Amino acid sequence: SCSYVVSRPVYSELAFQQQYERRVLKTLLPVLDWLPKYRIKEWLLSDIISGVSTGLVGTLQGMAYALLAAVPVGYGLYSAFFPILTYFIFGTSRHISVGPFPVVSLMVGSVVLSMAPDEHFIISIDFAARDAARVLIASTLTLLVGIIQLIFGGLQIGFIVRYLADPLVGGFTTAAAFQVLVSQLKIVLNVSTKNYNGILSIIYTLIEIFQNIGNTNLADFIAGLLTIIICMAVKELNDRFKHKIPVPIPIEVIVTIIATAISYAVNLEKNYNAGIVKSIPRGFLPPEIPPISLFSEMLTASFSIAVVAYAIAVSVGKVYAIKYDYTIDGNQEFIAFGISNIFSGFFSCFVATTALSRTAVQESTGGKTQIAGIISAAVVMIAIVALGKLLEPLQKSVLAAVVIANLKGMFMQVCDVPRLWRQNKTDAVIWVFTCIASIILGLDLGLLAGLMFGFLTVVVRVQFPSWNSLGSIPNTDIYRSTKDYKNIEEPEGVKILRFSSPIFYGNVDGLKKCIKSTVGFDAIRVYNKRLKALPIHSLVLDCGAVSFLDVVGVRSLRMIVKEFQRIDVHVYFASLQDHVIEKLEQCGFFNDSIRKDIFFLTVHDAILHLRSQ
Amino acid sequence: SCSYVVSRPVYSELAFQQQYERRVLKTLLPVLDWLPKYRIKEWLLSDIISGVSTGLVGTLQGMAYALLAAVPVGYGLYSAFFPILTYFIFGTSRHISVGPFPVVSLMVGSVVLSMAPDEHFIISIDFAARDAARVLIASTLTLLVGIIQLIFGGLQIGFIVRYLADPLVGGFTTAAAFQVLVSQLKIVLNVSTKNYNGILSIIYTLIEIFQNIGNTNLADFIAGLLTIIICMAVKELNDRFKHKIPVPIPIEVIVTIIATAISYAVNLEKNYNAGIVKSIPRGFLPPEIPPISLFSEMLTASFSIAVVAYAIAVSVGKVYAIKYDYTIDGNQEFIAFGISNIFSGFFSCFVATTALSRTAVQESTGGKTQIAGIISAAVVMIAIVALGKLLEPLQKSVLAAVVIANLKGMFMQVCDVPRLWRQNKTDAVIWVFTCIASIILGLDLGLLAGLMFGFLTVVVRVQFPSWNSLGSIPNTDIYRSTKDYKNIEEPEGVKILRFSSPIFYGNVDGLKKCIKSTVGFDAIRVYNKRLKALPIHSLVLDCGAVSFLDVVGVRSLRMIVKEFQRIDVHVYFASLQDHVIEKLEQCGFFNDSIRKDIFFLTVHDAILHLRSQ
Numbered sequence A, B: 001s002c003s004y005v006v007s008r009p010v011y012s013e014l015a016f017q018q019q020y021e022r023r024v025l026k027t028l029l030p031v032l033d034w035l036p037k038y039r040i041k042e043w044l045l046s047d048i049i050s051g052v053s054t055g056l057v058g059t060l061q062g063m064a065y066a067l068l069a070a071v072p073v074g075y076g077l078y079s080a081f082f083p084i085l086t087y088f089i090f091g092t093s094r095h096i097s098v099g100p101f102p103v104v105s106l107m108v109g110s111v112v113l114s115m116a117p118d119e120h121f122i123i124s125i126d127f128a129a130r131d132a133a134r135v136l137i138a139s140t141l142t143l144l145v146g147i148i149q150l151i152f153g154g155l156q157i158g159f160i161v162r163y164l165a166d167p168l169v170g171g172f173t174t175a176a177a178f179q180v181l182v183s184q185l186k187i188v189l190n191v192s193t194k195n196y197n198g199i200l201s202i203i204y205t206l207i208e209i210f211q212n213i214g215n216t217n218l219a220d221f222i223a224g225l226l227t228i229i230i231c232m233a234v235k236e237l238n239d240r241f242k243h244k245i246p247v248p249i250p251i252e253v254i255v256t257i258i259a260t261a262i263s264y265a266v267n268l269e270k271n272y273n274a275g276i277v278k279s280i281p282r283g284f285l286p287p288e289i290p291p292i293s294l295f296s297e298m299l300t301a302s303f304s305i306a307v308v309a310y311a312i313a314v315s316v317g318k319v320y321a322i323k324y325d326y327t328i329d330g331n332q333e334f335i336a337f338g339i340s341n342i343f344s345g346f347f348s349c350f351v352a353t354t355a356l357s358r359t360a361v362q363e364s365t366g367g368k369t370q371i372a373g374i375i376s377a378a379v380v381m382i383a384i385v386a387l388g389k390l391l392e393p394l395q396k397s398v399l400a401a402v403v404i405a406n407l408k409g410m411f412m413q414v415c416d417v418p419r420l421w422r423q424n425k426t427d428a429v430i431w432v433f434t435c436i437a438s439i440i441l442g443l444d445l446g447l448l449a450g451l452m453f454g455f456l457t458v459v460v461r462v463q464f465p466s467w468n469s470l471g472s473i474p475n476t477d478i479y480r481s482t483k484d485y486k487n488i489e490e491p492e493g494v495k496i497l498r499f500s501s502p503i504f505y506g507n508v509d510g511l512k513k514c515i516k517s518t519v520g521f522d523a524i525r526v527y528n529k530r531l532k533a534l535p536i537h538s539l540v541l542d543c544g545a546v547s548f549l550d551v552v553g554v555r556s557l558r559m560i561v562k563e564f565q566r567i568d569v570h571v572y573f574a575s576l577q578d579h580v581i582e583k584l585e586q587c588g589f590f591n592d593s594i595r596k597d598i599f600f601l602t603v604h605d606a607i608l609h610l611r612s613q
């Protein structure tokens, strides 16, 4: 077939260089960008239907997620209402539903419980004062998270979600599922448990729950178990019998309606001492300014919460945008969600993001634009203004059971952990480390630990690279490892070393050790022995994979060259890139008789030049 | 001259692979390793002289460094005595002098002051109880540091000192010099200042010192100023007039002797209210067991102290070992210094390492083995037993002035900062960040921040690499950037992209963006447009610099190949290494019609194969 025939002079860097010579409206994203281009002729009906469905789902979702935060039920409605209104303007995505999320709500509740415990705040029980303090703390945290997100949007650093690798995301997801399950199991059993803040809090909480298991309430446990069983059975049936009924069945809404109707009919509050919400405010509360003096105690938590919420939002937005053929601006997502969280924090709400289960419901029912979001917000308004009194008999175990039933998809990643281990060990290590760290520590500290562990893994992989001793395939220009191909001939009196990594301080010491191993000696010892008295004459360094270089690497290379030239051993460099040669030039490498004459384009010019002498 | 002539078939990976087929006594280092091989015939006299000189220096150094720790003078003698005895056995280096170091002592003193302040401990002044508590805390910290160092020696992780890059070491050195100068200036002026623990403590200390500057003592200030001037003048004269008097002049010992003799003669204590040591114990105190219950409050400090002390020790040891033609074991250095610090902590001592000035004094006077360490320990013992009473009149301002005079070499690195900026910007950024973060956060937190920042810099440099679009030099096999050489011809209907970095998640998104920019489009949009309806036909990826690869990178490459094959655009890979191909194989890449047939050895086989079709 085709043949490889090339005729050219043996080119050094100097010869090659002397023959061939070198050398305002999008930031505040308007609705005016797509409202004037609306298609009300056919989009309006689908938008209305989707908005009604997703509002019905989101009212219950907000009420349930208000329990994960240490906030009385009723502010979850505000958290499901206000962010949608303030995101309708600045939002890029046209398919996501804005509101609470079980993991972000759990993080917020952990912070709120830490800063306002029952025993520390009250020594009288003063439920009203405690609830007011918890609401204030949640609002302050939401405002801080919004400020951080807006600042990140201003700096246009939207690539940080790249650092959230899939293995650490999976580990954090599994740990968050465990945390949410423990909290909601505490709620379901109607068992009191003093809050634990700090390290290994989940283990202490589980121990105390299992100690007090003898004080469980029968009615709440039965309601939670039945809700979980019904919801999971319906989900499984819909998933298996999926060709018909394309849209998911809103089983949670039906279960909640039936449960609250039965509770009203039987009056479970007094006859069985059941735990009901017992209080939902009527109407809208006036806005209040949160106390910013707490900002110094909520930095390591607000940073993690902002990162996680933005990551979930952009993940869902991208998943639907690639499906519907459009693009989302990450910096604009920062800006929109930061404004949303600031607005929410000024109106007694906890942190807002998107949810995959709610977005799927909104999209599958015919979502076109964010008009469905406005319809959902209107439904939440109707629930707040009028439906407040009819949700009083509802039990909290029903909402906790809904959350527990939904936790399955998050719990199902230990299944693909082993495949990840089989493919790449580093990714499995990252997964396990992130999960364990988020279990031993909190979620906010676990996320930071996982991120920095990923950074360490990258640094370590760069630091300990693959290196080889090379020899030529006969009658070709192909050089491979001598100990791998069994037909490789080492050239006469010259060793070729390939160090497949950029050279920096860790790589500096690694490279010195590798050179000493490959050439069979070191220049310092032989030079000292020769001075006291008073096999290889050339070494080629294949530098085709040296991506970058620093001052320490340049100094190391200079010292290597000088030490080998002391004992009359020549050092040549091959396949160095142009920018690395520029870095060598600007770091003072080409001083004291180097002159760029020991550089060749590939590892065949060096060997041919060696044969000349 | 020589010519590049090669004739061979156009080799793909499959064709090449089917044609050429692949495939107990040192740990407890004895003195018995070198004592039986002693050369007492001529080494003994030089060892004795060097030991006497370095013991005279080290007694004063220990007394001076005992002030940097919040410990009464007298335990510095123990810290200069015990570690030498316990290092004489396990030590590898034969030229270093073991004892206190100003930066490590300052770190210990900061911890001790934080855990035992004057106002918190005493509300009576109870100097004896405060001193006892400070000594206990220092001993506990020393024991913890020794435990950590011994554990690190057991794990044989001695390469961690690689992570201490030269720029961050220089920045930390300058910050530590500033901290030591502030503390010793507080001591010299005889001005009381309430201790500050936390963030920006140095600024508050300086502000209060300048506020109380009106309460300075004249005698102490004059003594300190004269000592500083005399010491620095003698050092500069010796450095300039260096051809004669090869050994350094022990000006500090002479100054201290003269100052204490004058203080005894004039009795400066009562006539001028001067600040003298006033108390030096007679003899040796019995050992005591430190309270380990404090270990939970000294982790982030003990880790940094251990790292810094070991780094200084190995640095000095290597500097002298390369000079005298021998090698030092890093893990054995961990083991020796961990045992030394445990032994010191059990005997009321603070953390021990080596000092460059003391080591230079010991070596320049004919140091041969670690017998000069034993002689120095004997001199310190003589000073403890007998010379305790004659050092009572000595002022503390003299010792603080000695430390301040020695701080010049550490202060003299801001001069080399700008050259580092001119050569490599990342190294200068690391230097400045490490300097700044150790003044705001302190030394122990500053070191960790600098290490983290170095890891982030490495990750960022890997994440944003150099990428190019390649074309061939005519009548050769040389491919260079099209926009650089002005004689580069792009081939017919094919683009060649070089991405010079290993491919991971950050590099995954970077690579997708780079491919989209280079080919002028993306496969998803054109495929969707073509489906709605119902310039380049090949893309070569030069992967000669892809050092490693993970699961995310493999998935990204698979998706890129599939998306481009959807629109009848062929994707070829060239210059991939064998281990990266193995990683692709074990990550499931070669499934669903890939078959390793689109891989070529260099970027000339791919273009020749393209010309065939």
Ligand SMILES: CCCCCCCCCCC(CCCCCCCCCC)(CO[C@@H]1O[C@H](CO)[C@@H](O[C@H]2O[C@H](CO)[C@@H](O)[C@H](O)[C@H]2O)[C@H](O)[C@H]1O)CO[C@@H]1O[C@H](CO)[C@@H](O[C@H]2O[C@H](CO)[C@@H](O)[C@H](O)[C@H]2O)[C@H](O)[C@H]1O
Residues within 6 Å of the ligand: A111, A114, A197, A198, A199, A296, A297, A298, A299, A300, A301, A303, A442, A444, A445, B441, B445, B448, B449, B452
């Ligand atoms: C972008 C990249 C990431 C950025 C991350 C930013 C993190 C910022 C941390 C800020 C920080 C350290 C500052 C120095 C950090 C040095 C790090 C060096 C790292 C080197 C590699 C501030 O440190 C000081 O803390 C004081 C309290 O101790 C606080 O309050 C004092 O003054 C007040 C008046 O000002 C006065 O009202 C108050 O009374 C005073 O006490 C001070 O204002 C504050 O300055 C630590 O504070 C953070 O908040 C909490 C504090 O308790 C703490 O919460 C945890 O509690 C649970 C257990 O209970 C735990 O289980 C949870 O997890 C978590 O809820 C956090 O953990 C901690 O982090």
Ligand SMILES: CCCCCCCCCCC(CCCCCCCCCC)(CO[C@@H]1O[C@H](CO)[C@@H](O[C@H]2O[C@H](CO)[C@@H](O)[C@H](O)[C@H]2O)[C@H](O)[C@H]1O)CO[C@@H]1O[C@H](CO)[C@@H](O[C@H]2O[C@H](CO)[C@@H](O)[C@H](O)[C@H]2O)[C@H](O)[C@H]1O
Residues within 6 Å of the ligand: A445, A448, A449, A452, B111, B114, B197, B198, B199, B296, B297, B298, B299, B300, B301, B303, B441, B442, B444, B445
């Ligand atoms: C190998 C690689 C490196 C390893 C580094 C290891 C660091 C270990 C830190 C340990 C740690 C966090 C644990 C979780 C860390 C999570 C990190 C996540 C990072 C994600 C990227 C323990 O946290 C808890 O702290 C409690 C005290 O708050 C302590 O005491 C409690 O229980 C006791 C009875 O057990 C009881 O007697 C006691 O009364 C209780 O209070 C607990 O025992 C302890 O568990 C923090 O403690 C460290 O020590 C100090 C504490 O005060 C603190 O000192 C600083 O003070 C100055 C200002 O005053 C400051 O200016 C200085 O700098 C520094 O002197 C340190 O700063 C802090 O770090």
Ligand SMILES: CCCCCCCCCCO[C@@H]1O[C@H](CO)[C@@H](O[C@H]2O[C@H](CO)[C@@H](O)[C@H](O)[C@H]2O)[C@H](O)[C@H]1O
Residues within 6 Å of the ligand: A197, A198, A199, A300, A448
């Ligand atoms: C990019 C790098 C980011 C690094 C972020 C580092 C964040 C850590 C700040 C200080 O560490 C925390 O300080 C808290 C101070 O309150 C401790 O809580 C403590 O609170 C109580 C009071 O101190 C103790 O009794 C409890 O044991 C303990 O939970 C907590 O354990 C500890 O982790």
Ligand SMILES: CCCCCCCCCCO[C@@H]1O[C@H](CO)[C@@H](O[C@H]2O[C@H](CO)[C@@H](O)[C@H](O)[C@H]2O)[C@H](O)[C@H]1O
Residues within 6 Å of the ligand: B197, B198, B199, B300, B448
């Ligand atoms: C490998 C990763 C290593 C990560 C290491 C992280 C170290 C941080 C742990 C907790 O952080 C510290 O906690 C102290 C708890 O005491 C704070 O001191 C505080 O002590 C007083 C009491 O809380 C406050 O009033 C002061 O403002 C403040 O200095 C201190 O500021 C804060 O940094």
Ligand SMILES: CC(C)CCC[C@@H](C)[C@H]1CC[C@H]2[C@@H]3CC=C4C[C@@H](O)CC[C@]4(C)[C@H]3CC[C@]12C
Residues within 6 Å of the ligand: A218, A219, A222, A223, A226, A227, A230, A254, A255, A256, A258, A259, A262, A263
């Ligand atoms: C759609 C589903 C979730 C509706 C749930 C309705 C709830 C309120 C109903 C369903 C099953 C009921 C329980 C069934 C059996 C008993 C045992 C009896 O000795 C006391 C009442 C008690 C404990 C009931 C309490 C109320 C209960 C929990």
Ligand SMILES: CC(C)CCC[C@@H](C)[C@H]1CC[C@H]2[C@@H]3CC=C4C[C@@H](O)CC[C@]4(C)[C@H]3CC[C@]12C
Residues within 6 Å of the ligand: A174, A178, A202, A414, A417, A418, A432, A435, A436, A439
């Ligand atoms: C709240 C408590 C119970 C949470 C406990 C979480 C820890 C213990 C769990 C969560 C996920 C688990 C991992 C999931 C999958 C595998 C692969 C298989 O080889 C078994 C071990 C291993 C590696 C598991 C080890 C234990 C693990 C890390």
Ligand SMILES: CC(C)CCC[C@@H](C)[C@H]1CC[C@H]2[C@@H]3CC=C4C[C@@H](O)CC[C@]4(C)[C@H]3CC[C@]12C
Residues within 6 Å of the ligand: A414, A415, A416, A418
């Ligand atoms: C190692 C290979 C062969 C496992 C193959 C089956 C995998 C998918 C399944 C089978 C049994 C599973 C384990 C069963 C029980 C537990 C305990 C709990 O903490 C959850 C994780 C963990 C540890 C599971 C991890 C995933 C697991 C190991």
Ligand SMILES: CC(C)CCC[C@@H](C)[C@H]1CC[C@H]2[C@@H]3CC=C4C[C@@H](O)CC[C@]4(C)[C@H]3CC[C@]12C
Residues within 6 Å of the ligand: A199, A440, A449, A452, A453, A456, B296
């Ligand atoms: C990759 C890097 C960033 C990971 C760093 C994780 C470090 C800082 C964490 C992980 C687990 C943590 C430990 C978990 C439990 C305890 C027990 C407690 O009584 C004192 C703190 C101590 C001893 C913690 C110290 C800090 C610690 C060691």
Ligand SMILES: CC(C)CCC[C@@H](C)[C@H]1CC[C@H]2[C@@H]3CC=C4C[C@@H](O)CC[C@]4(C)[C@H]3CC[C@]12C
Residues within 6 Å of the ligand: B174, B178, B202, B414, B417, B418, B432, B435, B436, B439
């Ligand atoms: C105790 C307090 C006052 C110490 C303050 C130390 C800080 C402010 C000092 C220490 C070293 C200094 C740097 C040393 C050298 C240079 C290069 C030149 O271009 C001036 C700026 C720059 C980059 C300096 C900036 C300020 C700096 C970082």
Ligand SMILES: CC(C)CCC[C@@H](C)[C@H]1CC[C@H]2[C@@H]3CC=C4C[C@@H](O)CC[C@]4(C)[C@H]3CC[C@]12C
Residues within 6 Å of the ligand: B414, B415, B416, B418
């Ligand atoms: C920028 C180039 C031209 C500077 C060349 C001279 C260098 C070596 C010298 C000249 C003047 C010096 C600066 C003078 C004053 C200060 C303030 C103090 O905090 C020490 C560092 C710093 C910031 C010095 C750093 C080093 C410095 C910048």
Ligand SMILES: CC(C)CCC[C@@H](C)[C@H]1CC[C@H]2[C@@H]3CC=C4C[C@@H](O)CC[C@]4(C)[C@H]3CC[C@]12C
Residues within 6 Å of the ligand: B411, B412, B414, B415
């Ligand atoms: C030949 C070139 C390198 C000379 C540069 C000028 C040198 C001699 C001068 C210029 C500015 C000076 C610095 C100015 C300020 C300070 C802060 C002080 O607390 C310690 C000394 C220190 C750090 C000085 C050291 C010496 C210095 C760097």
Ligand SMILES: CC(C)CCC[C@@H](C)[C@H]1CC[C@H]2[C@@H]3CC=C4C[C@@H](O)CC[C@]4(C)[C@H]3CC[C@]12C
Residues within 6 Å of the ligand: A296, B199, B440, B449, B452, B453, B456
């Ligand atoms: C390279 C990376 C990991 C370095 C990270 C350093 C971070 C954690 C440090 C550097 C400087 C620090 C800040 C310095 C000063 C203050 C003021 C104080 O009242 C609250 C804490 C706060 C706001 C600190 C928060 C943590 C901080 C931002």
